[PDB]
Amino acid sequence: QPVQGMFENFNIDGLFFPVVSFSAGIKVRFLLGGRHGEFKFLPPPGYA
């Protein structure tokens, strides 16, 4: 389900990367796609 909120018009001078911040008592798993972690949903068209 999509969220009805969206960032835009931010600085693109630098380089971007995924990031997760956590405090404690947290167990999560990255799914980067393909051989590393299989996506649970089809990516939006055009996105890689």
Give CA separation, 12 vs 8, 9, 16, 28, 33, in Å: 11, 9, 8, 28, 24
Lookup result for tokens 């380089």: 15
Q: Are 39 and 33 in contact (CB under 8 A)?
A: yes
- Cα-trace Rg, the chain: 14
* HSE value, Cβ hemisphere, 13 Å, CA-based, for 29: 7
- Count the helices and strands in the chain (H runs, E runs): 0, 0
37 forms beta bridges with: 33
CA dist 31 and 13 (Å) reads: 26
Q: Are 42 and 36 in contact (CB under 8 A)?
A: no
Resolution (A): 3.3
CA dist 2 and 14 (Å) reads: 27
The answer for 23, left when phi > 0, alpha when psi is -120 to 50, beta otherwise, is alpha
33 forms beta bridges with: 37
